[PDB]
Amino acid sequence: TTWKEATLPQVKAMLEKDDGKVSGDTVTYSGKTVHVVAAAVLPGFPFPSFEVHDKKNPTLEIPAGATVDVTFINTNKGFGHSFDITKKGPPYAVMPVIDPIVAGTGFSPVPKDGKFGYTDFTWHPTAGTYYYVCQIPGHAATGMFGKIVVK
């Protein structure tokens, strides 16, 4: 996919653009268009994991019919995590069999020269349960995934 580069202050600014509301380990979105901003292993969080709205691998609740704008930022030095959406649930093998990927980013570039790679994609899901996972061998198997409920 097409990756762009952002400086640290830029990363901070984007993270706060997630318009979901957190409740426990759940982030609920509302409206015609929703904006999900996910990051791979923010400093201080467990490895390996995804952070959405400052929460570790939270369950995302999206209204059916809404246009989902996803922004994925890889803030983890040394690894090129991915954010791929599939219908296949856990447990995941070391080499996850999650085809077909409904929407996703593919492997991201590793942080370099004081910048972090990020990308944006749109998704118009049908009601159902999906999962966002990282395809780097072993990551999903060690907990790098979360659930998406479209209802």
Of 55 and 81, nearer to Cu ion (C-beta) is 81
In the block, which residue shows the tokens 């791979």? 40
Determine if residue 139 is labeled as part of a ligand binding site. Answer: yes
Smallest gap from Cβ 28 to Cu ion, in A, equals 25
Closest CA to 125 of 14, 36, 20: 36
Smallest gap from Cβ 116 to Cu ion, in A, equals 14
139 near 48, Cβ under 8 Å?
A: yes
Of 20 and 96, nearer to Cu ion (C-beta) is 96
Instruction: Point out which residues bind Cu ion (CB under 5 A).
Output: 48, 81, 134, 136, 139, 144
Strand (E) or helix (H) holding 11: helix 8-15
Of 50 and 123, nearer to Cu ion (C-beta) is 50
Of 48 and 125, nearer to Cu ion (C-beta) is 48
DSSP 68-101: EEEEEEE--TT-----EEES--SS--SS---PSP
Please, what is the Cα angle at 14 between 134 and 24, to 5 degrees?
65
Determine if residue 124 is labeled as part of a ligand binding site. Answer: no
Smallest gap from Cβ 102 to Cu ion, in A, equals 18
Smallest gap from Cβ 135 to Cu ion, in A, equals 7
Known binding positions for Cu cation: 81, 134, 139, 144
